[PDB]
Enzyme design. Structure first.
Site, PDB file in Angstrom:
ATOM      1  N   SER A 130       0.856  -1.180   0.000  1.00 60.81           N
ATOM      2  CA  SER A 130       0.000   0.000   0.000  1.00 60.81           C
ATOM      3  C   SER A 130       0.899   1.239   0.000  1.00 60.81           C
ATOM      4  O   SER A 130       1.840   1.330  -0.788  1.00 60.81           O
ATOM      5  CB  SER A 130      -0.913   0.005   1.226  1.00 60.81           C
ATOM      6  N   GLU A 161      -8.740  -6.148  -4.511  1.00 63.93           N
ATOM      7  CA  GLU A 161      -8.165  -4.977  -3.854  1.00 63.93           C
ATOM      8  C   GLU A 161      -9.234  -4.020  -3.341  1.00 63.93           C
ATOM      9  O   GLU A 161      -9.000  -3.301  -2.363  1.00 63.93           O
ATOM     10  CB  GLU A 161      -7.223  -4.245  -4.811  1.00 63.93           C
ATOM     11  N   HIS A 200      -7.418  -6.497   0.396  1.00 61.68           N
ATOM     12  CA  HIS A 200      -6.194  -5.716   0.408  1.00 61.68           C
ATOM     13  C   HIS A 200      -5.459  -5.870   1.733  1.00 61.68           C
ATOM     14  O   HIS A 200      -6.009  -5.576   2.800  1.00 61.68           O
ATOM     15  CB  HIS A 200      -6.563  -4.258   0.156  1.00 61.68           C
TER      16      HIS A 200
END
Ligand SMILES: *[C@@H]1O[C@H](CO[C@@H]2O[C@@H](C)[C@@H](O)[C@@H](O)[C@@H]2O)[C@@H](O[C@@H]2O[C@H](CO)[C@@H](O)[C@H](O)[C@H]2NC(C)=O)[C@H](O)[C@H]1NC(C)=O
Ligand SMILES: *[C@@H]1O[C@H](CO[C@@H]2O[C@@H](C)[C@@H](O)[C@@H](O)[C@@H]2O)[C@@H](O[C@@H]2O[C@H](CO)[C@@H](O)[C@H](O)[C@H]2NC(C)=O)[C@H](O)[C@H]1NC(C)=O
Ligand SMILES: CC(=O)N[C@@H]1[C@@H](O)[C@H](O)[C@@H](CO)O[C@H]1O
Ligand SMILES: CCN(CC)/C(C)=N/[P@](C)(=O)OC
Ligand SMILES: CCN(CC)/C(C)=N/[P@](C)(=O)OC
Lengths: 527, 531
Positions: free
Chosen positions: A200, A325, A438
């Site tokens: 991320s 995601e 995610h």
């Protein structure tokens, strides 16, 4: 005493701790100060090197977490608490950690440096899911992770001003990388074999060190998990950065930049956090208030421009995404969504969700998103609408920025390896409809399934050991192999699927959808 | 002496017909019936006047002249193109119609099919072998009418506002023919209260414009639109663009030596017909395929608004329509200007030729609009595969000009009271002379609807003769009842979007007339051009 836990670095002496793993001991040095505490008048300012100390620094436990917002969407829920701070919050937080084999290596050992994610507003190197004990024991590398300032303390910017220049959280990371260059050999690490990896915002941070020349000389390989510097969320322009900083001052009772920053430095840290989210220009998911700013210094141009104009021969990169995601972020503002039911939304909710998932675009742009993500034979099926708006958020923010980065890097000299992580953890506490969300490849990269106190299956332990081998192979040689994992190219677009099955080669990272975000939308917004 | 069944009295006078042989038995044909005064000399560009009554007997025994029009020379002598060219002499004295009726004449009123040919509003004729009405009338016992209407500049050159060349007189030709049917079809045994229009290509567009024009709407009861719609990007033109084309045609032929409209038209009226035809294609704004110089003009008269607006705002309860397309609507037009294309090679084009073809196939749109076309029709896993690019450009032209216009018309009619049936014609004729890469090209379902495979002199397979007979049954069933059925063919609706495939296999129901592609053309692209 145990001579293996005594280390002298440039600043002084450290005392470490011996840790246990199911595969044997490891040496850990936790809470090493690498910067002067950015307190009081140092708030918002670039970090400065930690001054030498006398005596022995106690490096046996994690240090404080940088001041940050604490998620309260699902109190006590492990799926969210695992990302929340697990140590006391403090602005005195610029510390790093070193894990190394036991006994310490006698010959230079490749180094992995972890930069955590958390949207530039949260995160900590002390979280359980970033425990470096298993990677170090299993693959015999040196693991370093650092804490860096987040939120306003790391990225509030009044561009041009020197009291609040912006990007100081990135400079925290650069300082830690300089610390590694000067001190990692004392732990057995090889300063000439440093591999950056993050997830991320951490992956976004890795990519920004790839496009900032003062950082380029501090490492040699990069791994970018579910993130990229060129997304729509990791950078902000100077004008919008100034508006947000100015707005934050107003909301906390503050008033000329010098006078503005002067007032902000008088406020308790928690006060700035309490108004952080209210400086965003609209309702959104996957948007964060204080992020890196493009002001010509750390980033001399937008990451997109820097990627297209770069010569990346000699660079090896490992990039990838998870299967779903978008799902995680939908419960933070998309109408109709939460972890608690099936999130089987309606057309009206889907259309409302598109403005939330793609904020700050013209109505025509939003209509274009609806055209491409609607199945016009089933325009109102709730299950398809749920999956589609997950695709919208995921491709717009992660998959397509990662696909663009990979394609241009490969087409400009870099050798790229791409993956899609497709295993849903047996221990996963979010609902089934979220798929592989995610952030849930990390625990496998760090070998957390090897912890006997947790409930992973035998297969999952084997799968974690595979992933640790791929990542460490890439750190040592620039290649995860040795069924083969082929490099990613702009034409063939080949990647592998990571799950309990053996490697499987596929083509295209949502190529149809990402042609829309990466090729057509920029043209539409320009006219 | 005389055969009483080949003698009919209409309001204008007496007629004499002929007895046609068909494989199934005799049919009466009255070919070349004058329904208007010849639009000659001073009457060029003017609305048609009704044919004045005559004494004596008019011999309606052969097809009359083809309205003056451009003759295609792309592949001289090639069957695939020559079948659409005039098979009678060219003349502005061309306003004649044809009636086919059973032999003997019906005892009771019989439903009427009225055919409107296509040809891009610049060509066509009711005399073409592929429009021969003898097989339909014999097989299904209907009355079939077809008319000639003026094409090219003679039918659709418009100086809007003027009365010397008001435009749309070609549509007024068909309207007068429809009026003739109301007043005279009973004399042939036809039922003026059961009249079904059907047409193909520009003929289908004409059928739709009669639906959206109130003065024509009372002249028929059902409609069939084959591979064409009134709302396509080629069937109509704006007032200002019509005058720009008319003014430039006049300039290219020495008129004036713009200005006063009367002097301009009077100068045009002195020019030989072929001189106007020789310059017809030069007035188009850019290089293109599937674009025609002189088409119906939206001037507020025949069409009070754009066909799109009239469709979206209309009440269509009590109407039955039959709509459809062929499998590869776009392929035929590519060899007329898209780079890389020919009927004589495989037309395996390059990516560069594909991008160039997008501007030819979607002309007069912004660069952004063209980029949107390239985004949707490119496979980004195989962006440069020549075969895929060939099929892609065919889809671009076919969706933009036929499929999506037909799909929008079908969906709005169904949502607003109409009962609609939709088909996709998927049989490639064994006799087709076009190359294999064209698939099922535009226009090649007509021969099966008209029962042409039943002609003994032709060489269709036995299966194709059964296929043609089944298609004729569907079309006649719709004409008689408003329903092609009696495996079922379900109505088309905006939600389910059900249609049937027409080929040698039994009816198969499917969903969506290229729903994904047509959502781009019908829903998104208009929003882009407005901004
Ligand atoms: C699925 O749940 C969402 C979330 O609602 C919350 O969580 C549920 C488990 C339950 O505790 C709800 O009462 C909570 O509000 C529902 O979306 C909400 O719906 C209510 C009205 O029913 C509305 O007032 C809220 O604003 C909605 N939230 C948002 C973000 O729009 C949704 O209706 C549920 N779907 C079902 C039950 O089919
Ligand atoms: C496929 O044919 C086109 C059309 O060209 C005509 O037909 C060919 C069969 C051949 O007889 C040509 O000589 C004809 O001109 C080809 O495109 C043409 O290429 C020439 C030169 O390469 C060029 O001057 C023309 O302008 C082209 N025509 C168009 C409409 O673009 C095409 O190259 C052929 N494809 C092959 C051979 O793979
Ligand atoms: C507006 C105008 O000048 N129009 C004239 C028309 O009135 C005149 O009758 C004709 C020549 O007789 O030429 C044209
Ligand atoms: C640590 C992973 N998490 C939390 C789920 C995030 C948000 N990473 P990134 O900053 O996403 C924008
Ligand atoms: C008669 C069928 N043909 C010729 C192929 C055409 C062009 N019909 P329509 O005018 O197409 C826009």
């Amino acid at each position: 005493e145990d001579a293996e836990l005594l280390v002298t670095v440039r600043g002084g002496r450290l005392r470490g701790i011996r840790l246990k793993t199911p595969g044997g001991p490891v040496s850990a040095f936790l809470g090493i100060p690498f910067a002067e505490p950015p307190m009081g008048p140092r708030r918002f300012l670039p970090p400065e090197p930690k001054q030498p100390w006398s005596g022995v620094v106690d490096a046996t436990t994690f240090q404080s977490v940088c001041y940050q917002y604490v998620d309260t969407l699902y109190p006590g829920f492990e799926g969210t608490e695992m990302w929340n701070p697990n140590r006391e919050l403090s602005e005195d937080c610029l510390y790093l950690n070193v894990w190394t084999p036991y006994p310490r290596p006698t010959s230079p050992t490749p180094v992995l440096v972890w930069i955590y994610g958390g949207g530039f507003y949260s995160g900590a190197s002390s979280l359980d899911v970033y425990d470096g004990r298993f990677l170090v024991q299993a693959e015999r590398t040196v693991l370093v992770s650092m804490n860096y300032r987040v939120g306003a303390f790391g990225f509030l910017a009044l561009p041009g001003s020197r009291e609040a220049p912006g990007n100081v959280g990135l400079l925290d990371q650069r300082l830690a990388l300089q610390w590694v260059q000067e001190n990692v050999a004392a732990f057995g690490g090889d300063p000439t074999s440093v591999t950056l990896f993050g997830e991320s915002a951490g992956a976004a941070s890795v990519g920004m060190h790839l496009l900032s020349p003062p950082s380029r000389g501090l490492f040699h390989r990069a791994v970018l998990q579910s993130g990229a510097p060129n997304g729509p969320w990791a950078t902000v322009g100077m004008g919008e950065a100034r508006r947000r900083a100015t707005q934050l001052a107003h909301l906390v009772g503050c008033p000329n930049d010098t006078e503005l920053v002067a007032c902000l430095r008088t406020r308790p840290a928690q006060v700035l956090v309490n108004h952080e989210w209210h400086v965003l220009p609209q309702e959104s998911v996957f948007r964060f208030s204080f992020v890196p700013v493009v002001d010509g210094d750390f980033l001399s141009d937008t990451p997109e421009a820097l990627i297209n104009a770069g010569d990346f021969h000699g660079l090896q990169v490992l990039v990838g995404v998870v299967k779903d995601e978008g799902s995680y972020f939908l419960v933070y503002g998309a109408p109709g969504f939460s972890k608690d039911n099936e999130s089987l939304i309606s057309r009206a909710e889907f259309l409302a969700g598109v403005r939330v998932g793609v904020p700050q675009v013209s109505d025509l742009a939003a209509e274009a998103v609806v055209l491409h993500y609607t199945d016009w034979l089933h325009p109102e099926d709730p299950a398809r609408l749920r999956e589609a708006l997950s695709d919208v958020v995921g491709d717009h923010n992660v998959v397509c920025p990662v696909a663009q980065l990979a394609g241009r890097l490969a087409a400009q000299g870099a050798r790229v390896y791409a993956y899609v992580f497709e295993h849903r953890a047996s221990t996963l506490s979010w609902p089934l409809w979220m798929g592989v969300p995610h952030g849930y490849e990390i625990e496998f990269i760090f070998g957390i399934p090897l912890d006997p106190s947790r409930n992973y299956t035998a297969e999952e332990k084997i799968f974690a050991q595979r992933l640790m081998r791929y990542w460490a192979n890439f750190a040592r040689t620039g290649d995860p192999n040795e069924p083969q994992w082929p490099p990613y190219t702009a034409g063939a677009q080949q990647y592998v699927s990571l799950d309990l099955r053996p490697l499987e080669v596929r083509r295209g990272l949502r190529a149809q959808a990402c042609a829309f975000w990466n090729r057509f939308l920029p043209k539409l917004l320009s006219a």
